[PDB]
Amino acid sequence: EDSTDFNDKILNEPLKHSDFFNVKELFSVRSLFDARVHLGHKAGCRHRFMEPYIFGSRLDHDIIDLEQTATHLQLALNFTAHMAYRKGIILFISRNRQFSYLIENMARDCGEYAHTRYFRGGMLTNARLLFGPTVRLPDLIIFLHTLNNIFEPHVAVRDAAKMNIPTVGIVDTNCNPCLITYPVPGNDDSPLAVHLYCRLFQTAITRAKEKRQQVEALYRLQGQK
Amino acid sequence: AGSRLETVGSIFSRTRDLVRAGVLKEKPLWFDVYDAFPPLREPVFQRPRVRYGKAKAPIQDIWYHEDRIRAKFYSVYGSGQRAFDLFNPNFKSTCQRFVEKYTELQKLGETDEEKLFVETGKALLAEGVILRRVG
Amino acid sequence: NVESFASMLRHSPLTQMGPAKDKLVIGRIFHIVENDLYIDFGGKFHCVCRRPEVDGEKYQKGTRVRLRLLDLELTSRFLGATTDTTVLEANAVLLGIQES
């Protein structure tokens, strides 16, 4: 009786709006350009599945089309916010050791989880044996870097798909985005770009959690009276 | 639980089908969100293939009309002893200042190339710019 | 009247610089390891230069230096590889300190 009204006013309501959390106000094509998000690797490193997202090559240096980055980033931030709103477990992953400390702090600050260390075989596909039969796996995995330190795809991309966990991922011009659910073409090397990503996801997640509390609190006050 | 055949369809299609077949008792927490705001591309595994024969990548080189003026400026006057400041988003080098003057004079009717390049150098020297020919 | 990405790219200092070889740029030291200076100069990758022998103590975090660029990204394809090997750092020569 009361459960259907709960799920209808709290869980189904936000899914009826194109931008319920107003994540489009967090960035612009200019702010992405100032953070050097458009700078890609040299043409000799290009991955074939990244050609659709490449604006061109400026003196053998691939340029990422920020017009597509903005549309992909909008979808990725929107999905992340809805998952945080629904109280999902969000796990950030990245083997780039220059940003390990930054990413672990960002995860602790937004109330989520980080795994920037060596990824042991079976953390996801054998979790019930490694953690316990009642362990809950992440509802969303966000790759700030999709490659491991030998320039191969992070093993967790394949294993997240095996466990049917949606993935958000920053994909540089040398990355493979085929199995990434919500890919975002962009620079994953420059500190300005990585810092921007961390601010956007952290802000999107923090807003969505505050929105969930505002809606719940309002739903309870109106319930009594 | 869900099928682990990550190369057969996508997590959405595999989940949707097993929910239909009654195999999955409940839909995962993300399913309703994906359905309302799907990605631009369905994440399906694909095998990367090397190109053979006459197949080429469709990426084009990024050129601008002013690149011809820059190539000539660097060949005549070399890189300006002034250092680039790539942190300033509005930085203007001696070459860019040369390109702008060159463009203004071209809009005034002048069409010759060799003549339009010598007049630009004089204009900058009158403004106090240092232009040391490399040779 | 929203500026497009094509307009930003055309008028960016990195685009207006043209080829990077033998170009003088201004860098900033953001990380130091013993005598290895990690310098950001506005590109995708940083460069690593060794502390000069003269006035070595003047090179600290935040110090702005002058560089002569050689390549924005060191890459190369070697025998049998399907893609290029990249060391994820630029190549530049540390000339000295920038002062006003």
Binding site: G56, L59 | Q60, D61, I62, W63, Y64, H65, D67, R68, R70, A71, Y74 | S4, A6, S7, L9, R10, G18, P19
Partner: peptide
């Protein structure tokens, strides 16, 4: 359409091909 789009042309910064010390000599 748009004036700021790239244009198709040959590399203007392309360096001339190197020549051996005997290029053009009998």
């Amino acid at each position: 359409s748009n004036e700021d789009l790239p244009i198709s042309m040959e590399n203007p910064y392309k360096e001339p091909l190197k020549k051996c010390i005997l290029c053009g000599k009998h």
